[PDB]
Amino acid sequence: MENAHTKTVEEVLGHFGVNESTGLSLEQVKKLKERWGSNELPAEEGKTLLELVIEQFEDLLVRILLLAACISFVLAWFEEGEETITAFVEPFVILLILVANAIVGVWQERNAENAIEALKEYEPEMGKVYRQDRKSVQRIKAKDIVPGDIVEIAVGDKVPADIRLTSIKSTTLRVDQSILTGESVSVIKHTDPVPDPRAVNQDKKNMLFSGTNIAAGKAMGVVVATGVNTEIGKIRDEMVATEQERTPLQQKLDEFGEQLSKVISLICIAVWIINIGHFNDPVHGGSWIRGAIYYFKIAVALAVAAIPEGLPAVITTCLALGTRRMAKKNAIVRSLPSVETLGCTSVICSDKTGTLTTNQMSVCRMFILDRVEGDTCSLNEFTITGSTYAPIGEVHKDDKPVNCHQYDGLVELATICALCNDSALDYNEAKGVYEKVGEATETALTCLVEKMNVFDTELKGLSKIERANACNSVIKQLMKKEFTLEFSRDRKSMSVYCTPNKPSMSKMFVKGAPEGVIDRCTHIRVGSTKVPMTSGVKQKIMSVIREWGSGSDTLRCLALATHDNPLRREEMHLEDSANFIKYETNLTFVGCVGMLDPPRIEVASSVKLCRQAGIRVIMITGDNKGTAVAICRRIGIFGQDEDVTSKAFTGREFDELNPSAQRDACLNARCFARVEPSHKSKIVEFLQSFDEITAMTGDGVNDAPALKKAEIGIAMGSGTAVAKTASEMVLADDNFSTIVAAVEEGRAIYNNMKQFIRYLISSNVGEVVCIFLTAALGFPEALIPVQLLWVNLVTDGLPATALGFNPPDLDIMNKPPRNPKEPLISGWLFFRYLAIGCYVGAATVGAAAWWFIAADGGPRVSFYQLSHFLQCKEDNPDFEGVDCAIFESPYPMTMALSVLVTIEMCNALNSLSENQSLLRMPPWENIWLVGSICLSMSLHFLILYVEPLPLIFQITPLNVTQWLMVLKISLPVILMDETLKFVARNYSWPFVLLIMPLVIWVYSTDTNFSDMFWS
Ligand code: BEF
Ligand SMILES: [Mg+2]
């Protein structure tokens, strides 16, 4: 069944072979089940643990670590030695770091799916259908309905399938379609066919779309589409068809991994090339192959040691900590890399109905009269602060609290509001929020009546379930509602006949569009006085009503009047519309109210903060252009008097725009209205075409393709499930300020990530340069792989985690988002961490050599003997026996390890700021860094001072003067990093007064290095 809206009821009924009054026979029911399936949206759960692990191993950094681990393992398998116990420790541990990380990430996934599923609406999805088995209404499951069923719908029901209207039994049919079409107000439905076959769902007035509630009335329809063929099903299919791309953080990490791999390959090739002439050495066997592969093995072993083993682990730790911080403020983030996406976001595409607004219409203004002199009147105007359906707001006149007993016109207005509606407000114990029963506007009037206690009834001890209807209950107990005059299309008003319950009358209460009520009223209720109507007062009322319904505060105005002396029920006949016209005569104007779909109270501040942070907010909605522009003006996207002739567009207007005009609109326009979900995705894609990180926010089904297409999609906690499944983050508490909070968190996370990435890379390149320098000169080895493993996982691991807690920059929220094209590590950074790395290598080699040359108490071995480590024989030494037993002493190794650790701690203290000096920013603020440094020193001393560990790591306790020399070697890294940082910047006192005694203490003495030869 295609374009059913274009066909009449007879055509669709003949096509389905179903009678209007009988329904479908049980045979046709199963015949349609076998063909069309069943009415369920498919729910696929293919994210098994194996799938999650394999997709989380997609990261290029993790792949590089895996390659390094496997190469190290195959190198350790062909080492022809008996030290396989330790030689295999280095790769294996990496695998643990690679696997444990995975669970962490996987855990986060499950945790998100455990939280997002918690905040899902759960109810039995039922449906009232007619079938030939029994004549009465049959309440069956919605999944057991088929295309062709005759469905009966009533007020406060959710339609279960795409339905073409057949007959309306309540003379009207109001449907709330904000879920699908994004319309803030309920739409009127009819039975007449829609001739347009390409018509959008907003103007399919004869159609009912699954997932949309019925605001008021009863109706009878026939199912034409079911399951995935419904509009929501088509949108879900489009959402699935949309491709998902990697987050910008993942792209930056992959680029950094490519740069790191290029550096590793260059280092390996260079080390191989430097030893071309040694290939044919007789030591290998005098062959061009064995020596070449031996030196290739050495070069690859050196290259593998330049990859930080713990870098992905600390990156994941920082991401998980940020995710936990966001979860603490009611923000569920699915993937760990997505926590950073909002930091680099440049454009925030949003949704008006249900996302930028509460979707709960509430009365925000009202007025009555106070006094009349002549050709004019004094007008009492009141403002109501409530925005949701909760009856907790207050009525303010001239921005001060006001009571309601003093204003008799106000109690009369409250009576008219509560008695001239048939909807209600009710509280869900499970959901925990008040909601409407029937029409949204009538619920707004009910909540207004609850807000202003016109009879000052006691409400302190009242429970929340009975808080919903207390004042309305009181003033409906006072007045008995006899009968209701139904609202008409030819007369935009509705009336209620009420009689005073107390004996010793029978007033009429009329509401509706202001024009009709004003032209049909000949009197004015001023306080308790019925004064004759005057042209001046009517003009004064028209002025305020138009300026209420025409400015940036565009409102839906309802005029409330009363008929004091109506004809008694015998005269009036409730049969014809013209009778209803003639019954409403000589009315008395009482007041007027003005309501809207109000934006959430944290929206204007959030958008101005986003604009301050360099992010522009563009509203994309399916509602009309007028309401969208009004909400943009109200929340601060547009000014009150700003011209929007080129900044607000409709889908039809955007359809035939020039490509240059489309580019200019995407660059400049800030409001899109009357756009289909495909149009929303097209807008998001056009914005992404300009290399802009786009964050889409929405709640409804129409936002799902746009939420999926954006780099990060944010779904409201009250939104639909399909919108939540397409979004990377969910706001559980529906707080829009969480967006700017997440932006700040992401920017801080990115800064800290850069800091500790630089720290780890510098440490590893320093160790590699140390090994290369040791090999080139010929000195005895100063470091061993197991020692480097410890100093890379603990001594470097703890400072990196602490650096993850770096204080945020002061000017973090006053800068534009970072350019996506810039690399994570720049060329200047590339130069700088090499400087610290080269200094670490040189300092560690020098510390190892100092104990063998100039240290007091150690052998004063010359450079020639020290360079010829392997030549410990009768080659004219001084202490030939002593030297052979001292070249393997643990003292130089301890010197090297201590110097490396101390320089790493100094570099960690230099990693508080990317370019801000340590003097101005002391370590005090990041107390986590100080605690981590102290803990690492404590455990290092424990390693140095226990029984087993000095055997496992060949290290021994040092002396006071030896520690002093270690500090002497380590400290200048502070000076060199400070001068590099100062150079970068150019182109407190307690910290100084504590560090000066330390500096003067350790530079009291100096030792000369007797070495003037190089290899
Ligand atoms: F709900 Be949005 F206005 F499409
Ligand atoms: Mg919405």
From Swiss-Prot:
Q: Which InterPro entries match?
A: ATPase_P-typ_cation-transptr_C (IPR006068), ATPase_P-typ_cation-transptr_N (IPR004014), ATPase_P-typ_cyto_dom_N (IPR023299), ATPase_P-typ_P_site (IPR018303), ATPase_P-typ_TM_dom_sf (IPR023298), ATPase_P-typ_transduc_dom_A_sf (IPR008250), HAD-like_sf (IPR036412), HAD_sf (IPR023214)
Protein origin, superkingdom: Eukaryota
Where are the Phosphoserine residues found in this chain? S38, S528, S577, S660
Query: Where does it live in the cell?
Result: Endoplasmic reticulum membrane; Sarcoplasmic reticulum membrane
What reaction does this enzyme carry out catalytically? Ca(2+)(in) + ATP + H2O = Ca(2+)(out) + ADP + phosphate + H(+)
Using the UniProt annotation, give all residue ranges assigned to the region (Interaction with TMEM64 and PDIA3).
785-1015
Question: For ATP, which residues are the binding ones?
Answer: T353, E442, R489, K511, R556, T621, G622, D623, R674, K680, N702
- List the GO molecular function terms: ATP binding; ATP hydrolysis activity; calcium channel regulator activity; calcium ion binding; enzyme binding; lncRNA binding; P-type calcium transporter activity; P-type calcium transporter activity involved in regulation of cardiac muscle cell membrane potential
On whether Protein biosynthesis is a keyword of this UniProt record, the answer is no
> Where are the Cytoplasmic topological domains?
1-48, 111-253, 314-753, 805-824, 914-926
- Of which family is this protein a member? Belongs to the cation transport ATPase (P-type) (TC 3.A.3) family. Type IIA subfamily.
* Record remark: domains: Ca(2+) and ATP binding cause major rearrangements of the cytoplasmic and transmembrane domains. According to the E1-E2 model, Ca(2+) binding to the cytosolic domain of the pump in the high-affinity E1 conformation is followed by the ATP-dependent phosphorylation of the active site Asp, giving rise to E1P. A conformational change of the phosphoenzyme gives rise to the low-affinity E2P state that exposes the Ca(2+) ions to the lumenal side and promotes Ca(2+) release. Dephosphorylation of the active site Asp mediates the subsequent return to the E1 conformation. PLN and SLN both have a single transmembrane helix; both occupy a similar binding site that is situated between the ATP2A2 transmembrane helices.
Q: Protein name, please?
A: Sarcoplasmic/endoplasmic reticulum calcium ATPase 2
Native organism: Homo sapiens
